[PDB]
Design a protein around this ligand. Sequence first.
Ligand code: SF4
Ligand code: SF4
Lengths: 611, 611
Amino acid sequence: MYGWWGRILRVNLTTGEVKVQEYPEEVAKKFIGGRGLAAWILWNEARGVEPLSPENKLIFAAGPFNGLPTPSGGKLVVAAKSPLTGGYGDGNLGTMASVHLRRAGYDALVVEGKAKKPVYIYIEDDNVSILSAEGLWGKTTFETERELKEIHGKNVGVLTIGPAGENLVKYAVVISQEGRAAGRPGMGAVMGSKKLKAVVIRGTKEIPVADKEELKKLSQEAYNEILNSPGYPFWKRQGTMAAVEWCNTNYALPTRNFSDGYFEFARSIDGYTMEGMKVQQRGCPYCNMPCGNVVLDAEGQESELDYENVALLGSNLGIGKLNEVSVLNRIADEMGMDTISLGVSIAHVMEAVERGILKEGPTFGDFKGAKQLALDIAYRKGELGNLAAEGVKAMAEKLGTHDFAMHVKGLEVSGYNCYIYPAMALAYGTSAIGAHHKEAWVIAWEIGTAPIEYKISYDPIKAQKVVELQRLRGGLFEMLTACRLPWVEVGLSLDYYPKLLKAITGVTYTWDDLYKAADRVYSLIRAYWVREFNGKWDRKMDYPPKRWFTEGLKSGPHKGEHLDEKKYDELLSEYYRIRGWDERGIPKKETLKELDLDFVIPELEKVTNLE
Amino acid sequence: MYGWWGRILRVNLTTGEVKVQEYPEEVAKKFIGGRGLAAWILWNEARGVEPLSPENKLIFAAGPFNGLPTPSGGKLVVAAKSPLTGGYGDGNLGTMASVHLRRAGYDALVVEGKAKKPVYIYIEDDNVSILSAEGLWGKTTFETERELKEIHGKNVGVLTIGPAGENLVKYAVVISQEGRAAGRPGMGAVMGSKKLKAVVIRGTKEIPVADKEELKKLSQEAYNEILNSPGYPFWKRQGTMAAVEWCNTNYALPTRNFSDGYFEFARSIDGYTMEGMKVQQRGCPYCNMPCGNVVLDAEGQESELDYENVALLGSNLGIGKLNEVSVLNRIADEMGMDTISLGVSIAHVMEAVERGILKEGPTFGDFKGAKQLALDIAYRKGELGNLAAEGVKAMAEKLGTHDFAMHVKGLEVSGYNCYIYPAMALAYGTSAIGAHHKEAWVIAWEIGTAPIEYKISYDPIKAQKVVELQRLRGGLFEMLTACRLPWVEVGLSLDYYPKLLKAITGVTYTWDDLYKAADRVYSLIRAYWVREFNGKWDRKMDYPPKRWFTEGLKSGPHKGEHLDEKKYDELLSEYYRIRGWDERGIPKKETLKELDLDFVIPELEKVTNLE
Ligand code: SF4
Ligand code: SF4
């Protein structure tokens, strides 16, 4: 076997047992890695488990591209049954831990059980130990990684959780290298529930490559193509922050809990403003187009800015000064909580306060109040911090505020306001893990323009475009696993991927093979949700928030415009037709058989009727 | 006598003598105060003196508006014979020193002589002393003022020089409250040449007012008019920083030593970027429309930004990040040196380096090199730093780089590139103290738009507009002395001024009375220059820099356009006709008699032939 090790590191925190599981080359070829491998593991090992119980499996899954010098191939997938959504949950982050896990001889790391006290997992090739982290517990993510490196050396990959993870904030994430984050659906809370403070990894092994020279050649070509792309200069300057102006121009910038798609103060929180306050730039392993832009916040502290962070903690909160939004951003990284769900939870509180629903709490534009709430959420201080720490779905159940609860499947909607964007609304509605733009950022195509540089339509071809994008963004890139931005942003040819894959693994994958592996992952993931939800499931699970159907844009040429539910419903049926799912969004028996998921049928039938 | 004290504090640092000069009420009425009073004093007391010798007079002149609660009436004029230009030199700054000097019982303070060692002047009502400042010498302006208040208390007004003043940098200024500056033509160097490190002032006396009730009424109306003006909100947000975009849009933003009027990276150093970096907002005494916008620079330090500072230290130097420009800005303030002349001098060096004329030094866009040169100028360290510390006129004589030496009469050109703006070019050409936009910011009217919110033309009305603006901006406002921005930016009515002047002094001044006093000051100032130049004077003294006639814009729909020498010369003759001046730029015997300036006739006749 080349590329894949066929090895998965297993750590049981309850028993202290550490072992290496060998999985068949057939499974590796069939699921490829990252999310695929994770979905296979969770389907088999997390049936009916409580997300915060010792039985949940915390998975760190790499893929064949990882550990090797592949173009922006320093990504890693973190997965577990989600404490926020109750379904399959995952996330991705660039981190040296990805390079080291693979160079240490493993394709993935699976943590089960729960330690008796705070501990961290140490991995140096074949030497794996569960060590006491009593001294680290309570420290920020930044401080935890800094201290671990002060002991073991700079040459290690470190994954940590901060107080939000330790306190089981439902959208707590895993942090690496002060800025890289993974696991919006609460991977950080699953990590915290096991009393797992960090993971330190070092690898030195040579990963067996089927064609060393092709690999080295293809990689050099791709790097050069990136360096020579016309978008490279502007990408180097603004990175994802170029989307603030682009979204504002197109009425897609979430403003005041998604109330409007335009923000009057977007310029003072945009990419140009960011350029003027940038002090450093860093990136993920093996990437020659770094986009981790670091600024100084209002308190003079370094903060790494990404578009989503700014959109959800800036315009979405009615906060118009980038230096202030940057303080909130830093807090999220330090505490280890998702900037998106954090911002949407805060915005939800702000709307409830302005409406008189909540007697106390911050209002839109209130930076000091937003900062205090962010901190109270991470430390679960007071009734408000505790409520908001649960996310908008849970919070809305308690407050009767479902009308303005911006989420899909319990996962908070990200940085694109879709009052007039049917395809993007469908992307959020059908995202495998819950509302996220990860799997299909189709709004650009719907508009005809993109950040590096209108008539509302429900054409069934939009459902086809979303499935196509999900195959690449929610499948391929989450399985390799590698950054999708070189392709998305600078236009690196997708042809490099199946070639790099054969050069590495020696297996020839055609685009249809890849499209099929991605579809298998999608149906398996959906199957997981259906099974864990005990068959209680229908098409409404794939609907975007009610706000986009009952309210419209508040300003500009498109004022009053919104989504037509009837037409959205028809577009959803088209999505199901293309995926081979029934009108409830559940995979059909024939579809499962065709995707080599026969094993799913018996289990799903114990819970509902299949078609 | 009301309003005016009719008293001038006299401090001789050579003899240690402190006395109070009582001057005539008719002189007070005739010159009003500020620059008018200063020009009267310099004509009489700085005849033929070397600017850096003990005989030069350093004047801190206030007017009837000062010390009283008048709308933005906390300004102060600092004047002396200029070490940079060799003629009349002055500047203005907002400072509690203004309020305290007048409440202490004086209309002005005149310092003559030179101390044997560093000293500071201490003024508390009638108690005035020259005290040792040996421990303060060498400290920054910020630290000097901070330490003085730690001794004397926070309720004092303080004026200081930093190392640039101490080291006689030709464009050294006087600084107050970390950000307020005065005296571009080297007032700081004059102060430093006297070994005067600072002036600390405290006043408690009630200033006699003709009509206290009218004064209170008018000020209140004016304050409310400011608060309710349509421009108030945007002014509060961006202040003068709104000019970066306005100038860039109009090809008037000095870029790379005025090479072009358009900067490709203007957005990253503009007013919106500043808003996203603002952490504090300060202002001058008695102002309800504060514009001292404080940001954190690239090193996390506070830096108060003004348009000119950013245009001359940013676009003019090819530096496109506001955080970096802010480091240069803070250095200028700390060292006590003019941001404009500093930037124009650094830009001059950058062009000479690029052109190979200088073999060592910073080039455009080199922030680290610019910072090092700014520090070397302040401390006069090295041949290059010592040369640039002399100003562009002097530096150009040594390097043979007159072609790109942007100055008029030795004073560096400010933040408006006039390749296609004849009236603004004439404003710079005729400015009483040398190149400055202070006396006539006519570019706004020439274009038809303003920052608060084209066809070239040499229409003789342009000269009439420059004269009208000079009467107000270089006359009235420099004599009161009060901020001209409420009127300029927010549209406060000019009708308040004659009414407040009457309520204060009891003397009624019709607009014609004020225009005559302003022209009187302009002709007296002109007479001072001619006299001091020993009659060596002609119309070329009032010409804009050669570059605006010799080259044109480098981009935009106006690419290649420049000023025309013949049409400019005709426009200048129109300016002379309106002012009653020779074709050499010297007042006519009839004009001098007209303005009650007969005493200057004998003096000018001794040096040249009058008309
Ligand atoms: S483009 Fe950005 S997110 Fe992608 S690998 Fe590079 S630094 Fe990481
Ligand atoms: S408008 Fe600005 S410069 Fe004028 S008095 Fe007010 S704070 Fe000072």
